[PDB]
Amino acid sequence: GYDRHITIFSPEGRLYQVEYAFKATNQTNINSLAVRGKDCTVVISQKKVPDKLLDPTTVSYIFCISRTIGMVVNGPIPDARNAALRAKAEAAEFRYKYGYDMPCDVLAKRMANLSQIYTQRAYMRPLGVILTFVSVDEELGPSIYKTDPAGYYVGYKATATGPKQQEITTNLENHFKKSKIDHINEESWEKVVEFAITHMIDALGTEFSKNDLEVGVATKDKFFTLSAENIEERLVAIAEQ
Amino acid sequence: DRGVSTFSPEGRLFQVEYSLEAIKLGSTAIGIATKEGVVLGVEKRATSPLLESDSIEKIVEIDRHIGCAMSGLTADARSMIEHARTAAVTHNLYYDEDINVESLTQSVCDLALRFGE
Amino acid sequence: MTDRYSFSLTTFSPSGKLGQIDYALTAVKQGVTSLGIKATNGVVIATEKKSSSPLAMSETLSKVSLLTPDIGAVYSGMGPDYRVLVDKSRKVAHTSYKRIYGEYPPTKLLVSEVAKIMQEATQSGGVRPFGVSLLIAGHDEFNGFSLYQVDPSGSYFPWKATAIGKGSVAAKTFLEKRWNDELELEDAIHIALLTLKESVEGEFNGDTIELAIIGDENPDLLGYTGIPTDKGPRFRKLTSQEINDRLEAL
Amino acid sequence: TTIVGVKFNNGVVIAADTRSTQGPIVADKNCAKLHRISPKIWCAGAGTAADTEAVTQLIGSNIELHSLYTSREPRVVSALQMLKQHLFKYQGHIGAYLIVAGVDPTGSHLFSIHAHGSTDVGYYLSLGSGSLAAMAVLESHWKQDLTKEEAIKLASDAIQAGIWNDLGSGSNVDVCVMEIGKDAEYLRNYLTPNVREEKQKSYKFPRGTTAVLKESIVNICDIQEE
Amino acid sequence: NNYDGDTVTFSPTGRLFQVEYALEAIKQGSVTVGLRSNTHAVLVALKRNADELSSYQKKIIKCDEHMGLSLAGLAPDARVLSNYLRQQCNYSSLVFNRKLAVERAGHLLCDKAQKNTQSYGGRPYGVGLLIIGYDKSGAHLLEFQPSGNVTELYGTAIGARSQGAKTYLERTLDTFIKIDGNPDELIKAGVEAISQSLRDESLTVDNLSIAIVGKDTPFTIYDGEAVAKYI
Amino acid sequence: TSIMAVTFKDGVILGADSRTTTGAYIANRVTDKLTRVHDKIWCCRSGSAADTQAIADIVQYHLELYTSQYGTPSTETAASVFKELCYENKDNLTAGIIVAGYDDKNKGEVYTIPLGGSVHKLPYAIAGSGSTFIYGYCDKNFRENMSKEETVDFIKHSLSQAIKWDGSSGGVIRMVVLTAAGVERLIFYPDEYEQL
Amino acid sequence: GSRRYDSRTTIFSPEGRLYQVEYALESISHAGTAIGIMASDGIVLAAERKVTSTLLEQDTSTEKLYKLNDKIAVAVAGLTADAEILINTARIHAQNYLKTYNEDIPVEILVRRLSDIKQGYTQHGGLRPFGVSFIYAGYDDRYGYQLYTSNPSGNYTGWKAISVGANTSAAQTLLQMDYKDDMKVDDAIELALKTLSKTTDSSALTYDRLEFATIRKGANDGEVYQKIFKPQEIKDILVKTGIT
Amino acid sequence: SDPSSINGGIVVAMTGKDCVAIACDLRLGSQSLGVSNKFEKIFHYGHVFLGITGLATDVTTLNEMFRYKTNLYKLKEERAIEPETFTQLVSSSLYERRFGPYFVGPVVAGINSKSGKPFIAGFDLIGCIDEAKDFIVSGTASDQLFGMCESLYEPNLEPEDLFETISQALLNAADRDALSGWGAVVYIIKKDEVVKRYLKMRQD
Amino acid sequence: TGYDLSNSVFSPDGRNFQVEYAVKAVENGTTSIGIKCNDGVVFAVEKLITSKLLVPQKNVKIQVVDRHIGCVYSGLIPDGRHLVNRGREEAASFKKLYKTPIPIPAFADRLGQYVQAHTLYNSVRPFGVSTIFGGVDKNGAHLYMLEPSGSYWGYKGAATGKGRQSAKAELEKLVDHHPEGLSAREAVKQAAKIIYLAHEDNKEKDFELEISWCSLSETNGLHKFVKGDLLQEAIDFAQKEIN
Ligand SMILES: [Cl-]
Ligand SMILES: [Cl-]
Ligand SMILES: [Mg+2]
């Protein structure tokens, strides 16, 4: 039974190492969510600092890949940082060679192709991570593209990742069935973040303090992460209506 | 299977210990050192009477002042002899002298553990 | 480090079977149904856009891909494997042909190059076979219209019409009854939509179906005027609306 | 060689002459110096003929594969970057002097590239042996906010200046117009001011004039059946 | 058990069995003792013969004028490592006109042994070394293990029955450290130390091997009738 | 070419002419020799246009990758990357570069990198063929902690003279102002600066 | 490390057989039968396509018979993809020889080169062998008309008549019975088809299930012509010989 | 010293009405010394004709190279190569030796078997294509050939007339060049018949 | 089963058992700690005295990287040395290209990526060490801890080895009782105490204390070893607290 140790086909036409890499994805026990506004793309993720000895400012699963592209990871931090460093390198090289900023979907495809290689080549293991890339593309507008250990990737209206992804997914599905549009009809990104947090609260059934969340926002020509105090202001506005 | 350069639990290299068993199956060779000279003798051990025994070469010259006898898988010795002869002649070229018997032996033994994967 | 897997991971078993190729074909069997039909004045290729989530934008995922202006491809099996094959196929069409002869390769020779890449993954060191079967439709001046299937082994066969993946056995039977040598392109598209409806469970419309044709030259899609000999690509992907129009006359 | 590029209201136009030389001899009277990199990105080339063609085909090939990879229409800055990096790498030994122009999702663009890898931006440019004759015209008549019709006129006038005044340039005028939101129109032989006059005499010989030694049929066909 | 096939494999309790098996080869080897004072450092080695016709295997190797070691285990591996030290000592002299520090010599051996324990294909070294030397910070004694661990000591012993000599030195610690400006008395203490590891056999003229380095004493090896004085 | 960079109270200002020559022919009369390698780190280019462009393109790539990993780089760090390229490839390059940038901590800084690949941190720097004619003028007229308006006048007057005497220099005078306020581009035409 | 997953494709069994070669031969025994018959005035190559479909485009199809050069052709039995790798190598070798010596490559030399490549995969490299057996039909001015076969072991032999693929035991017996030395091409054509017709696993032998080719000096004067038969031409020769 | 003028030689090609013609001299020399008077410079791969001038070793080498490549093309494509396609193959093959080129001046001539359109083309030693409607010239007497062709040539000549025009162009050009001559061959090419004529010329 | 025999193999859980076995080697090692203070960091380690024959203060465990970073580790000592050698190469190339000394977060990822790379292939073994490291840069003081998996985070206090639980408890008290912060000289005293308290888990053999520190005020942002009177002062403070 060595067909379960390396990335070769089983008799059922399955790749067990790829399937087990999907299971490593939920090892951190963190849930993430991404949604699109009119002018922006918002990504939120649970933040858990169990140890008091930890410096909470360094605990993060959201990455600034380029000025325009942000990436949230679902999976162990070593593999997460591996993917982040590579994506940063690829994004920089793209700009140098082709003279314009790498689009979100193109980076996603590139990382997906790299992941595909690990599913075909034996000496390389898959990374146990799911990469969610977000930006406001200059052609396609607000964009969410997600990659997994199988090498699969696709664009999204909205998306969710983690142990309780299905609860979040259905919650978002039901909202877009009502509104009958592919995004959050809202002008400011602040209110889109408020929507994202509100619908995660409803889906998970848990309340959040300022230190329980982590937020990333993509606007035209820049991606940035919110501080604890920026999130607190967001939580106050939600509670007051 | 298992590594070629693997240690046993007793602290011995499996492959080295197994090669020693192959040498025990080989034909006998004897050497005696005296103050008047060193004598080397071997058992030829022909597998059949039709085999011309004088073609069995188990005693071999390395240089004018160094000889060699072998026992075991004798085909393996050819590259060792070639190295020894080259080492002996090369040293004479570099230093205009005969090479010490110990130094020659050390050069041959350096090849021994150059095996792996 | 170093790739120390320099040995074959696909080997003959006592019965003469190449296990990894068989298992790759099993992965293709599980894949979504895709088909191809050849007409007198064109070729059609089609498949279902099996969306993994309703939040996912299925337009961003292209199962039917342009390889050259006159050649297209569709698959069944593992999507990621297909994606990299298309990248390699597009590149080899340039490096091993267009940069030499100054023109795009004929269908059969591009298929031959793709087949070669898939064969090498079946024999080279430290790799598994590709878990896909391709259907490649195309046109060229001297061979006319043509449709080829390519398997994980690297084997390829030309077809008048065929289907691969989930419900291929039933779909091939359906095509045998309907196919003839006097079919026009519109008739082939009609038959393609009928055949594909049998294997689809849920929604059946322009948004859940992906369909492209190799037909007449499209000067409107060329992007420039001023060269009479350049008349445009024969490959065209049908729009969501264009599919729905033909579903009313179904 | 005279090649020019002129920007206008809603796009860009490039033009070129059609002479190819081998020292003082004319090798081709109707040479095509306007190359297509992609459908809406065209470049005009001066210098070593084989180099401008090869470097344009290579970058055009890689631009096509890039456009397929990214699912986007190619940009002029991409062709510009790929070209200059290629030419810089060969330290000027690939003698290609190009004027790259086109329209893309970002807008209309006009650049020049030299064999050593330097790029320049402008509203009007000219390269080649007739670039001084052409630039004299451009500097005299160019203005901001040109119409398409005014730009084509300026560009072809600039090429004519090279054709008449430069011995390295001659014959006809080729043009390519790349307007925003439109197909690019390649106007091969837009002007033909150098048609040869009728010859005074016909030099058609009487059949049998030339002395022959042998005749034979050449077998071009394959090996035959039966 | 299942985790001793190669060096690249941890066991479930976090052990490296191939390294431990290499450590076992040292215990099978003949005893050797190392000790030092503030002025001198001494190596004493019990050489082993194959039989009565054979010679006694050499245990001590010179690395430089101010440094050398004694071995216990696979002798060819000691030749590889001593050759490496010779080169490193030599690189330091040629490039920096600087005698290599004994502590830095230990660090280099550690890092060389380590690479063999983390990579596939190779194997750990099957030998233990006792390095003595005199540098700018006085006399030194090091103990090298092929796991990579190198340790600076006042005295020590490795090989078969080495625990007896190691206990003696642990008692004598306060005495032999004070033996300054007296090489013969420091060797006497080393010969008396190695004697605690002997059974059946005793120290003969072609059995014993001694080496010394110090303040105004280059690394020199004593064999044959040169050590009869100390028997 | 006439290029210069001058530190002052609020930050630093880069200045340059706009002439590119091929012998005595002016291949480009509206060249932009002030190029951006990072938000508030710019450079002035002199020498080969191909070499200086290729270098600046690589540096921009390095600092973009630096920023993605370690955050905003210092002006000294940018100068070091330029240096490493110019020094290690000195046999094959002809590039005289001035690096200038603004930090909040270090404020305005100027580093000049001549042909050899050596680095020199200075209060102000001048370079290019036309710089030779204004060494005397710039040394006599430079002061530390000048105002923005004073510094603009200093650069404008200096480059005006460099343009006047050097045939390889001319066209418009471009300037780039780097302060905490942001990045301001300036331009001065012949009719303005010739009458000075 | 990686040793754990190595099949060791190039080793001997205790009996002194090459495992992978033997298993590759087992694979080939399930492939469509291919027959080669050598006559005094030419060579015949016949081969059976494997369970085809009515929707297979036959006239543009090629899975069995391939052209190496103008004088030499091959019939394939085994993995088609593996065969095409070797075929392209053989085509190149023939052109290298022609460029070097300005003469068409002798048949045996080409066969030996391909057979040596196959041998290499059984002795070194750790890769699986090619699961292919060839029948070489060719002509040169030294030995005239020649038939050879090669298999995954890299061993090759010359033949008057030979079969590869499925049911070779039955096919070889039938050929051994009716073959004679003074035989001609037209007779050899009939023998090849009659042998396939009896050994086939199909119910009946039809034009759409066959690939056929001849190498004849039946070309205008001293020269050799290769004829790859078209579907309609195979249909006609089936009627002529009296099989359909 | 100059590689392109050690051996000497010329090639010329012309188009006519539903026909093309290609011609060459037969001289091969070592500078002043004439060595061979049977050194033909025109070759054919199926129905596509290639004339090559320049350094004789490279002429021989390139013929063997294009024979190699066209034979493989045919095996894979299952059809003979066309002039338009072969022209691109020559350009590709020459430019791959950009910084160590073959010192040759190729000329392609033929008729497209599908369209029936006559086709000629010329190249420089590194690949540049000159696809002329009227005529192509190459060799040590290319200046002479340009002058003859540019005056003698008229469009839409019948095969038997075209033969006279191209033959006189070659002969009179070669007689003004010291390194060309020693015989001549003319190919007249129609869609399905090709005639080859050796000309009688002065042997000095 | 068999998933734990080879490195870089996912088990059906999604775990890399070989990395988890490397952690066992770390847990077997001596105790080492790190304390982040007001303007710097303090490192301390437990050195087991196996024998009287060990020369005091000679077998130094804590290692410097560049001139501003300190590194200490528990587990397989040679593996730690290998990691520090790489760290020194990474720091050298950074300073070579970018001029400035490598920032601590930048340095942390260099080690992190390198350790993580040793979980990607079966041809290499994971690192048998958890490394505590940090120092002072332009942005201030930073303390990090890096595991065999390549996982690392920033820390206020860090501890690893056989006495990590005892140490962690002591560090947690300091974080609670000093929200405004701890001074560099205080941190040295506390570091000594924590090692002495953590020595109850290795109480068979006696031990030797070794401390180092980087501080903006006390050491000018350079890594230095605590020696002589300041070391003895910390030992006395530690001995007083256990009694
Ligand atoms: Cl890719
Ligand atoms: Cl510039
Ligand atoms: Mg003469």
PDB file of N, CA and C in Angstrom, chain E residues 3 8-14 16 107 111 114 117-118 120 147-149 151-155 166 169-170 173, chain I residues 4-5 18 21-22 24-25 51-56 59 76-79 81-82 85 118 122-127:
ATOM      1  N   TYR E   3      12.523   1.729  12.191  1.00  0.00           N
ATOM      2  CA  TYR E   3      13.014   3.096  12.042  1.00  0.00           C
ATOM      3  C   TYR E   3      14.542   3.176  12.094  1.00  0.00           C
ATOM      4  N   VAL E   8      17.931   9.032   7.897  1.00  0.00           N
ATOM      5  CA  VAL E   8      16.950  10.089   7.665  1.00  0.00           C
ATOM      6  C   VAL E   8      15.643   9.876   8.456  1.00  0.00           C
ATOM      7  N   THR E   9      15.588   8.833   9.288  1.00  0.00           N
ATOM      8  CA  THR E   9      14.348   8.424   9.957  1.00  0.00           C
ATOM      9  C   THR E   9      14.430   8.482  11.489  1.00  0.00           C
ATOM     10  N   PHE E  10      13.673   9.411  12.069  1.00  0.00           N
ATOM     11  CA  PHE E  10      13.366   9.423  13.502  1.00  0.00           C
ATOM     12  C   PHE E  10      12.504   8.225  13.905  1.00  0.00           C
ATOM     13  N   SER E  11      12.706   7.739  15.129  1.00  0.00           N
ATOM     14  CA  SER E  11      11.823   6.733  15.724  1.00  0.00           C
ATOM     15  C   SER E  11      10.682   7.452  16.444  1.00  0.00           C
ATOM     16  N   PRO E  12       9.638   6.712  16.866  1.00  0.00           N
ATOM     17  CA  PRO E  12       8.510   7.354  17.557  1.00  0.00           C
ATOM     18  C   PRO E  12       8.855   8.076  18.868  1.00  0.00           C
ATOM     19  N   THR E  13       9.978   7.725  19.491  1.00  0.00           N
ATOM     20  CA  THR E  13      10.448   8.411  20.699  1.00  0.00           C
ATOM     21  C   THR E  13      11.503   9.485  20.396  1.00  0.00           C
ATOM     22  N   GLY E  14      11.705   9.784  19.113  1.00  0.00           N
ATOM     23  CA  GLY E  14      12.623  10.841  18.686  1.00  0.00           C
ATOM     24  C   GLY E  14      14.088  10.443  18.683  1.00  0.00           C
ATOM     25  N   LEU E  16      17.497   8.500  16.760  1.00  0.00           N
ATOM     26  CA  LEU E  16      18.125   8.178  15.481  1.00  0.00           C
ATOM     27  C   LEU E  16      18.983   6.929  15.652  1.00  0.00           C
ATOM     28  N   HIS E 107      34.264  22.564  16.461  1.00  0.00           N
ATOM     29  CA  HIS E 107      33.057  23.057  15.793  1.00  0.00           C
ATOM     30  C   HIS E 107      32.988  22.600  14.337  1.00  0.00           C
ATOM     31  N   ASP E 111      30.086  19.964  12.661  1.00  0.00           N
ATOM     32  CA  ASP E 111      29.282  20.327  11.493  1.00  0.00           C
ATOM     33  C   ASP E 111      29.466  19.361  10.325  1.00  0.00           C
ATOM     34  N   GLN E 114      27.482  16.153  11.269  1.00  0.00           N
ATOM     35  CA  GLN E 114      26.042  16.426  11.288  1.00  0.00           C
ATOM     36  C   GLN E 114      25.382  16.218   9.927  1.00  0.00           C
ATOM     37  N   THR E 117      24.118  12.861   9.111  1.00  0.00           N
ATOM     38  CA  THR E 117      23.005  12.369   9.930  1.00  0.00           C
ATOM     39  C   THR E 117      21.625  12.879   9.498  1.00  0.00           C
ATOM     40  N   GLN E 118      21.589  13.867   8.604  1.00  0.00           N
ATOM     41  CA  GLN E 118      20.327  14.483   8.180  1.00  0.00           C
ATOM     42  C   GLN E 118      19.977  14.217   6.710  1.00  0.00           C
ATOM     43  N   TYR E 120      19.764  11.676   3.119  1.00  0.00           N
ATOM     44  CA  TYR E 120      19.515  10.324   2.627  1.00  0.00           C
ATOM     45  C   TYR E 120      20.704   9.838   1.801  1.00  0.00           C
ATOM     46  N   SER E 147      27.644  11.451  16.464  1.00  0.00           N
ATOM     47  CA  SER E 147      26.341  12.110  16.505  1.00  0.00           C
ATOM     48  C   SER E 147      26.480  13.599  16.171  1.00  0.00           C
ATOM     49  N   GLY E 148      27.680  14.138  16.381  1.00  0.00           N
ATOM     50  CA  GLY E 148      27.976  15.546  16.131  1.00  0.00           C
ATOM     51  C   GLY E 148      28.432  16.253  17.397  1.00  0.00           C
ATOM     52  N   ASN E 149      28.086  15.683  18.550  1.00  0.00           N
ATOM     53  CA  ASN E 149      28.378  16.293  19.844  1.00  0.00           C
ATOM     54  C   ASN E 149      29.873  16.336  20.156  1.00  0.00           C
ATOM     55  N   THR E 151      32.709  18.000  22.989  1.00  0.00           N
ATOM     56  CA  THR E 151      32.744  18.456  24.376  1.00  0.00           C
ATOM     57  C   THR E 151      34.180  18.717  24.838  1.00  0.00           C
ATOM     58  N   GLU E 152      34.411  19.890  25.426  1.00  0.00           N
ATOM     59  CA  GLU E 152      35.714  20.227  25.998  1.00  0.00           C
ATOM     60  C   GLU E 152      35.794  19.744  27.443  1.00  0.00           C
ATOM     61  N   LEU E 153      36.899  19.082  27.782  1.00  0.00           N
ATOM     62  CA  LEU E 153      37.047  18.402  29.069  1.00  0.00           C
ATOM     63  C   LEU E 153      38.452  18.581  29.644  1.00  0.00           C
ATOM     64  N   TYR E 154      38.586  18.354  30.951  1.00  0.00           N
ATOM     65  CA  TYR E 154      39.897  18.264  31.603  1.00  0.00           C
ATOM     66  C   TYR E 154      40.525  16.912  31.288  1.00  0.00           C
ATOM     67  N   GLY E 155      39.704  15.871  31.356  1.00  0.00           N
ATOM     68  CA  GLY E 155      40.128  14.513  31.047  1.00  0.00           C
ATOM     69  C   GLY E 155      38.949  13.670  30.605  1.00  0.00           C
ATOM     70  N   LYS E 166      37.747   6.656  33.272  1.00  0.00           N
ATOM     71  CA  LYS E 166      36.989   7.896  33.428  1.00  0.00           C
ATOM     72  C   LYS E 166      36.671   8.194  34.897  1.00  0.00           C
ATOM     73  N   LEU E 169      40.109   9.375  36.628  1.00  0.00           N
ATOM     74  CA  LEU E 169      40.343  10.782  36.301  1.00  0.00           C
ATOM     75  C   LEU E 169      39.405  11.704  37.082  1.00  0.00           C
ATOM     76  N   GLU E 170      38.189  11.230  37.344  1.00  0.00           N
ATOM     77  CA  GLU E 170      37.207  12.002  38.106  1.00  0.00           C
ATOM     78  C   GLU E 170      37.622  12.147  39.576  1.00  0.00           C
ATOM     79  N   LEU E 173      41.109  14.434  39.440  1.00  0.00           N
ATOM     80  CA  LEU E 173      40.925  15.753  38.812  1.00  0.00           C
ATOM     81  C   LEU E 173      41.778  16.867  39.418  1.00  0.00           C
TER      82      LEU E 173
ATOM     83  N   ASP I   4       4.293   6.934   8.998  1.00  0.00           N
ATOM     84  CA  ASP I   4       5.302   7.542   9.871  1.00  0.00           C
ATOM     85  C   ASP I   4       6.740   7.119   9.546  1.00  0.00           C
ATOM     86  N   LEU I   5       6.910   6.274   8.531  1.00  0.00           N
ATOM     87  CA  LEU I   5       8.232   5.760   8.161  1.00  0.00           C
ATOM     88  C   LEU I   5       9.007   6.720   7.256  1.00  0.00           C
ATOM     89  N   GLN I  18       6.697  12.245  11.061  1.00  0.00           N
ATOM     90  CA  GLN I  18       8.143  12.429  11.186  1.00  0.00           C
ATOM     91  C   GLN I  18       8.512  13.736  11.881  1.00  0.00           C
ATOM     92  N   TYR I  21       7.735  13.298  15.510  1.00  0.00           N
ATOM     93  CA  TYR I  21       8.789  12.524  16.164  1.00  0.00           C
ATOM     94  C   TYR I  21      10.025  13.379  16.444  1.00  0.00           C
ATOM     95  N   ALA I  22      10.281  14.365  15.588  1.00  0.00           N
ATOM     96  CA  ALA I  22      11.366  15.318  15.821  1.00  0.00           C
ATOM     97  C   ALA I  22      11.099  16.151  17.074  1.00  0.00           C
ATOM     98  N   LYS I  24       9.718  15.073  19.728  1.00  0.00           N
ATOM     99  CA  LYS I  24      10.081  14.225  20.869  1.00  0.00           C
ATOM    100  C   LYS I  24      11.557  14.377  21.241  1.00  0.00           C
ATOM    101  N   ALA I  25      12.414  14.538  20.234  1.00  0.00           N
ATOM    102  CA  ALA I  25      13.836  14.799  20.460  1.00  0.00           C
ATOM    103  C   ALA I  25      14.045  16.147  21.148  1.00  0.00           C
ATOM    104  N   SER I  51      29.599  15.333  34.225  1.00  0.00           N
ATOM    105  CA  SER I  51      30.774  14.889  34.964  1.00  0.00           C
ATOM    106  C   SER I  51      31.567  16.072  35.517  1.00  0.00           C
ATOM    107  N   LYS I  52      32.344  15.814  36.567  1.00  0.00           N
ATOM    108  CA  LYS I  52      33.285  16.799  37.115  1.00  0.00           C
ATOM    109  C   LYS I  52      34.361  17.184  36.093  1.00  0.00           C
ATOM    110  N   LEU I  53      34.622  16.287  35.143  1.00  0.00           N
ATOM    111  CA  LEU I  53      35.661  16.480  34.128  1.00  0.00           C
ATOM    112  C   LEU I  53      35.328  17.546  33.074  1.00  0.00           C
ATOM    113  N   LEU I  54      34.064  17.959  33.006  1.00  0.00           N
ATOM    114  CA  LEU I  54      33.655  19.076  32.150  1.00  0.00           C
ATOM    115  C   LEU I  54      34.284  20.378  32.633  1.00  0.00           C
ATOM    116  N   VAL I  55      34.924  21.109  31.723  1.00  0.00           N
ATOM    117  CA  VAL I  55      35.554  22.383  32.075  1.00  0.00           C
ATOM    118  C   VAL I  55      34.459  23.442  32.211  1.00  0.00           C
ATOM    119  N   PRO I  56      34.354  24.083  33.392  1.00  0.00           N
ATOM    120  CA  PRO I  56      33.320  25.106  33.579  1.00  0.00           C
ATOM    121  C   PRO I  56      33.442  26.293  32.616  1.00  0.00           C
ATOM    122  N   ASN I  59      32.011  24.926  27.413  1.00  0.00           N
ATOM    123  CA  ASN I  59      31.081  24.368  26.431  1.00  0.00           C
ATOM    124  C   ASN I  59      29.890  25.298  26.208  1.00  0.00           C
ATOM    125  N   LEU I  76      18.608  18.188  19.625  1.00  0.00           N
ATOM    126  CA  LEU I  76      19.874  17.735  19.047  1.00  0.00           C
ATOM    127  C   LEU I  76      20.789  18.928  18.760  1.00  0.00           C
ATOM    128  N   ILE I  77      21.854  19.058  19.549  1.00  0.00           N
ATOM    129  CA  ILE I  77      22.728  20.236  19.494  1.00  0.00           C
ATOM    130  C   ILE I  77      23.324  20.466  18.098  1.00  0.00           C
ATOM    131  N   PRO I  78      23.816  19.399  17.436  1.00  0.00           N
ATOM    132  CA  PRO I  78      24.359  19.570  16.081  1.00  0.00           C
ATOM    133  C   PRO I  78      23.356  20.137  15.068  1.00  0.00           C
ATOM    134  N   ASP I  79      22.099  19.704  15.148  1.00  0.00           N
ATOM    135  CA  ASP I  79      21.042  20.235  14.278  1.00  0.00           C
ATOM    136  C   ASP I  79      20.869  21.742  14.472  1.00  0.00           C
ATOM    137  N   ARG I  81      23.228  23.838  15.557  1.00  0.00           N
ATOM    138  CA  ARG I  81      24.419  24.460  14.975  1.00  0.00           C
ATOM    139  C   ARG I  81      24.295  24.603  13.459  1.00  0.00           C
ATOM    140  N   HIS I  82      23.778  23.563  12.812  1.00  0.00           N
ATOM    141  CA  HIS I  82      23.536  23.590  11.371  1.00  0.00           C
ATOM    142  C   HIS I  82      22.578  24.718  10.999  1.00  0.00           C
ATOM    143  N   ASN I  85      24.346  28.084  11.372  1.00  0.00           N
ATOM    144  CA  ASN I  85      25.257  28.288  10.242  1.00  0.00           C
ATOM    145  C   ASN I  85      24.520  28.846   9.033  1.00  0.00           C
ATOM    146  N   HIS I 118      12.718  21.298   4.973  1.00  0.00           N
ATOM    147  CA  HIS I 118      13.086  19.963   5.451  1.00  0.00           C
ATOM    148  C   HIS I 118      11.880  19.114   5.882  1.00  0.00           C
ATOM    149  N   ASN I 122      11.319  13.321   1.297  1.00  0.00           N
ATOM    150  CA  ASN I 122      11.730  12.139   2.076  1.00  0.00           C
ATOM    151  C   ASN I 122      13.247  11.915   2.095  1.00  0.00           C
ATOM    152  N   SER I 123      13.969  12.680   1.279  1.00  0.00           N
ATOM    153  CA  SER I 123      15.422  12.575   1.188  1.00  0.00           C
ATOM    154  C   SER I 123      16.130  13.341   2.303  1.00  0.00           C
ATOM    155  N   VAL I 124      15.368  14.077   3.110  1.00  0.00           N
ATOM    156  CA  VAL I 124      15.922  14.803   4.252  1.00  0.00           C
ATOM    157  C   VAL I 124      15.112  14.553   5.516  1.00  0.00           C
ATOM    158  N   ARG I 125      15.776  14.737   6.652  1.00  0.00           N
ATOM    159  CA  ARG I 125      15.174  14.561   7.963  1.00  0.00           C
ATOM    160  C   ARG I 125      14.791  15.938   8.510  1.00  0.00           C
ATOM    161  N   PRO I 126      13.666  16.029   9.247  1.00  0.00           N
ATOM    162  CA  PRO I 126      13.340  17.297   9.908  1.00  0.00           C
ATOM    163  C   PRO I 126      14.352  17.676  10.990  1.00  0.00           C
ATOM    164  N   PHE I 127      14.379  18.951  11.365  1.00  0.00           N
ATOM    165  CA  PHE I 127      15.279  19.413  12.418  1.00  0.00           C
ATOM    166  C   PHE I 127      14.805  18.934  13.783  1.00  0.00           C
TER     167      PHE I 127
END
